[PDB]
Every structure is written in C-alpha cells, then in structure tokens.
Structure 1
C-alpha cells in the first residue's frame, strides 16, 4: 500500500514499556508507515507539564534505539499546527488525548488514538524495589 506518515509527540522521560507499546501501536496503524516522533523541549515541558529528569539530548538518544521509530524531531513544537503537518507531510497525528486542543485534528480526519499501559512505568519499578524493605 502507499506510505502513511504518522506523527506522535511526547516527553518520553525515562522510557519504559508503556511508551514503547504506544509507539508500536502508532507505527502499525497502517501496513506501510513512517513514524515521526516529536520530543518536547526541557523548558516547555517543565513550564506547562511537570518535572523532567532527563535532558532533551538524553530523552532523544534513548528513542533512537526503539524499533518503531523512523524519524525524530528534537525538540518538537509544543503545540501542533496545520503548517507543521504540511511542512513534514504528516498524514496522521497519533495521540491518546488524556477545551479539546485536538478538535481541529479530528475535524481534518488527521487524528488516530493510541492508548497507555498502566503499571509498567519506571517509577513503578522503583516502588517494586522498595516493597522488599518492610516498614517494620
């Protein structure tokens, strides 16, 4: 089939199985895709979202090693725009939306949902380490 350009953005701090399953899902939305992943800058993540432990450079170097990732934009825009989609020939934005800042994307037919996997996160694994030390 024809090659579909998919865009997915995120913070990707301390990459874990949860991000990877999401990336894999974005990549397989169609039989032939190019998955572009956008990695948010440090400043704007902290300003708008929350604490980041890894720098942009580290967050991006880890993503380079994931099988599903075809291209990375680093840093990426914090807000996706129609001009951005035209410039990089993006057919679909892959998100999990979790008023609606993505309504124009749905109206344009350019939105494809992916999902999160709970309980697989890096912070969760440290919780598991700590359970081995009894409170008493």
Structure 2
C-alpha cells in the first residue's frame, strides 16, 4: 500500500519506554509509513511547558537510536501549522483544543501515553529502598 507520512513531536527528555511505545504506535498506524519526529527546542520547552534536563542535541542524539524513527526535525516548531504539514508532506499528526484544525482536516491520529514507566519513575523506585524510619 501507499506510504503514509506520520508526524509526532515532543520533548523526549530522559527517553524512556513510554516514549518508545508511543513512537512505535505512531509508526504502526498504517502498514507502510515514514515516521518523522520533531524535538522541541530548549528555550520554548522551558518557557511554555516546564523543566528539561537534556539539551536539544542530547535529546535528538538519543532519539536517533530508536528503530521506529525514520526522520527527525530538530528543533521542531513549537506550534504545528498547515504550512509545516505541506512542507514535509505530512499525512497525519500522531499525538495523545489546539488540535482542532488537525481533526477538522482529517489529519489527526490518537496515540497513548503509558503511565508508570518514566525515567523519573525508576528513580522513585530506587529511593523506595530507603525507609522513612
């Protein structure tokens, strides 16, 4: 079947199994896809969303090792626009409102976040080896 271009974006700080599963899901939305992943800039992430440990370069270099990722846009724009979709020939945006125009255009595909598998979740498990008392 025809190849389908999928776009996902995010911070991908401290990349963990939850990111990987959501990238796999986006890659597998159709039988033949190209998965483009956008990685948000340090300045815009901190200004608009919250704290980020790793630099853009670190977050991007880790992401390239993930088998589902076919292309990376680093940094990506903070806000997806129709012109951006046209420039990269994107058929669907995969994400878990401001996506209203994407759904109106038929270009939205839902993916899911997995709870309890994050990198900081692992550090909490380490800390729980040390009793309060």
TM-score by length of 1: 0.97
Q: Where in structure 1 are there 5+ consecutive unaligned residues? A: none
Alignment partners' CA distance in 1, 2:95 and 2:128: 33
Alignment partners' CA distance in 2, 1:61 and 1:86: 26
Instruction: Identify the residue that residue 67 of structure 1 maps to in structure 2.
Output: 67
Query: In the alignment, does 2:113 pair up with 1:122?
Result: no
Alignment partners' CA distance in 1, 2:36 and 2:11: 14
Query: In the alignment, does 2:45 pair up with 1:45?
Result: yes
Segments ≥4 residues shifted beyond 3 Å: none
CA RMSD of aligned residues (A): 0.8
- Count of aligned positions: 133
Instruction: Identify the residue that residue 89 of structure 1 maps to in structure 2.
Output: 89
Q: Where in structure 2 are there 5+ consecutive unaligned residues? A: none
Give the CA deviation at 1:131.
0.7
TM-score by length of 2: 0.99
Alignment partners' CA distance in 2, 1:80 and 1:127: 34
